[model samples]
Target: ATNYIYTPLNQLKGGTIVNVYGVVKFFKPPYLSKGTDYCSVVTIVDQTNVKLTCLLFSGNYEALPIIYKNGDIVRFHRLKIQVYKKETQGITSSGFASLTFEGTLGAPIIPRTSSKYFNFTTEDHKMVEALRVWASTHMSPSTLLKLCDVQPMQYFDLTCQLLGKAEVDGASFLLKVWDGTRTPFPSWRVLIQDLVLEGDLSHIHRLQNLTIDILVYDNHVHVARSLKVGSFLRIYSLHTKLQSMNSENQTMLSLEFHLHGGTSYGRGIRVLPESNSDVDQLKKDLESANLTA
Candidate 1:
């Protein structure tokens, strides 16, 4: 914390140890690298709202889950930015800059074992205050259909039921769930976004609907198998994106959600009881009638 220079996300480059802080946004599933080591990806945002991605490794992440969940503001200290080619990921070169936590992390930005990063330190008031403020504002959640309507590529909260499930190819799986229908503007702004942009907001499209499809990686394969279809779930820090179906005929566009690598490290993916409001609503919908397209 002391030796690292403070830097904004937009200015990071190669070989500079800079300190950055932001509410933990999302973390990918943690997995073993070489035999016993671990590797994970974490995304955070600062006051500037600039997104910074960190490549955390070896028990360095899961070991200290203190900052593991979303909305915790912490400092990444003495982190040198490593720029790499964006050969596969969807972003530009700027998005490819990252920080690693392997051989170079002895610098106790927190500590080794019983390390402060994984274990909270009483002395860091700024960190504590920052987190309290973040949670107070970010605590509110948006509904699923409304969320998909906007299709912002970010995190949110969703409580819904697993409508159905199916295995795709082999490496990935698809989960169908109903968040909420196109609840009429429910908001006063009535900003006719679709009428304004030729993509109507009033009538919601099918695939352009809110459902969760996670390409579960190998590490999560075991856990993913345990999720029985029709179970109720309350997932915090949900990540989503609005995608278009590139085809010549149907003009079909869809909104898809991902829960695979680099995005699974979230607040919590939980199973809710059958009596809960969301769960009850889901059951009602199920018992009323059933028909699939």
Candidate 2:
């Protein structure tokens, strides 16, 4: 019989076979400190009971890039614990640890096999029309309009004819959809990002127009909100829903939204730019971004 250890970070010892499930809440890339390469750290939470923090060092970091997103469900094996400041604070694994995931393990479960979930090519006008018709019934008029103007994987140039309401958090803004293009509705309700708007409600009606753009990718879209309520400008870009591979060979998807967008600062949000750019690029990107094993 195989023994599975389910213990808190403090109780973990070296070489413990454990099955832990949690949403990855934070991630830090590999950095060199004092001439040594330290593994990345990932903080996770079961959210139902309590939170757990897991650290992956050395070869394990390289092997488990697929399960290291901010909102992913990762099941790991052979986690060793380390202490910090008199508290059990970290977990490490050998390069041979195992990891697996489900399609819905992270955010929402949008089946990859569903044709409706995939993007349509420019030539697929009939499909586009069908999508538009579907949007008319399911989405608001403003969202529908935005949906129509979308060119897959392109930056959206938007002009707000009218301002309804705005919700802001941090660098992000959530504006009420009054008129213009339609926004895509996720199959499930997911919090993409917190928002913060920089305008008064009374000013909404007085504003002539607002302009912005959206960054789109496989499973997520990011809206740029740094511009003032009325201006003509170009928003910098980034890709969303990038895919990766876990040890269990499942496909997982990530949904992230950046509120104040310019261009992406690094390659983190570029969506598999280092690999081949063909049909295989799409496949590899999908595999890297989704939790669908």
Candidate 3:
């Protein structure tokens, strides 16, 4: 009853169907979608250490995030590997970083298999421990805030500190962010930084504020409404919309943060704890003035 062909992550080619099993390097939760029911992404890596990004559309995408944690290996049976050209992919930032392959699943094609989309319940489930050992040795990192470098219209992840939020005309609130990432060249201390007297920016954290438009729809409203000034946040799958500004033109390098009631492999957000190591380290670095324009 095995209608699927098994292949290693890197060995996959063409529009072929394959059953791939690997450690869940990481999994982005299935956020609700508007057009489709839900859309989610799962990152897995095989023995070759080659990583694969699996784009999933499942009926029960809702629970997958809660069930699968990092280092878990699951069988992606009867999933088709689809190739995306550079033009259509929209990830023209770097080399293979943008050139990507995605594995999609359809439950009906292999009815012999139980479960909805993935088989994480098999005996292979125990391999999770082995995966953890391997993961501790090879797992990579994740973050966002530099989508400014990615081609406009492409999606990227980011992390930054919020300065303030203001109402815009058509879209969502205008969020002023500071990450000390790209302080516009010939950068002068932005007058906006003066607004946040609590940060003690005299040391020059570079004081770059990425003016982003946050569009929150449906239930994501609560998450969006919980914004606070000077708080750090982690944003995922945020698409870089046409660079900056709003009605009748305002704010330089202004961008958009689109959040749907559902996530179609797009905009996701989370508040970073003040005590987090990353945030604390960033604070120290900001005081150090290690970066310059």
Candidate 4:
């Protein structure tokens, strides 16, 4: 007599009968149509590193609740075999197959390890040096000095004490900020729209050390076309005329500041608090549609 053996459909035609295992990495919902429904399909695997793609067509979808725990172990019988573009595959159906519970399996774990695959190296240092040289050679001396003194393009941590506020237009308002050092540096007039006042300006007189961030612009000229008397703000900028009367009323050398967000061609200053977190978090919040920072 000759011995005979049988193999599952998933292992037919030279398909190896190996224990397949891995976690349910991810899953997608089954497709549905109007007035008709179909069985769900899923992929499963075991610790032996073998993967099985299974289909629960028709009646098989009902058993899914019992077998498809995220980390559960399942074994199947009579899985059918198929060939992908260039790979072998397996699938199982309830009407034509069966599944057995193997209890909850241990969770697949990945270790937290640091890799230097994206580390910045000497090449980065050379690039930075080249950038610095380009910036130094291309920028104005005053602007270059400002850039070098602070972190490149860094905004100054400042606080504006709103001595008063006035509406410039439907979209712009002016605010006055003071640090209380009061060395008589020109007062800054900031025109902002779409703004949220962090702290109450009604009690502005009682404020001290209230911090904010500002971008300093040098030698900003104010033209008469859009400047307003009651709404104008002043800040320490480069020296200009004092409108004085003298035998030779020379243009006085004085510190001056410029207005931002007014109805003119000037800088657009975005103010922030000094206590803000890392730059990435601040940028993330801005990207998330937060109007205030």
Q: Top lDDT: which candidate number?
A: 3
TM-score between model 3 and native? 0.44
- Candidates' TM-scores? 0.39, 0.35, 0.44, 0.26
Error of 2 at 54 (Å): 2.2
Give one digit per residue, the lDDT tens place, for model 1 in 117-167. 432344444444554455456543323333325444666666666654545
- Lowest lDDT 10-mer window, candidate 1? 87-96
Question: 1 or 2: which has the higher TM-score?
Answer: 1
Top candidate on TM-score is: 3
Per-residue lDDT of model 3, residues 192-287, tens digit only: 323533332442344434233345555555455567777887665655555455465775554445555455454566566674545776566444
Whole-structure CA lDDT of model 3: 0.49
**Per-residue CA lDDT of candidate 2, range 1-293, in tens?**
53444454334554444545444455543322223344545665542434556656553223543432234344455566555666555565553243322212122222111122222233233322333343344333321123224333443322222222244333443432222222342211123333333444554323222222223232112322323443222122323222343346886532222323322221122111122122233334334423221
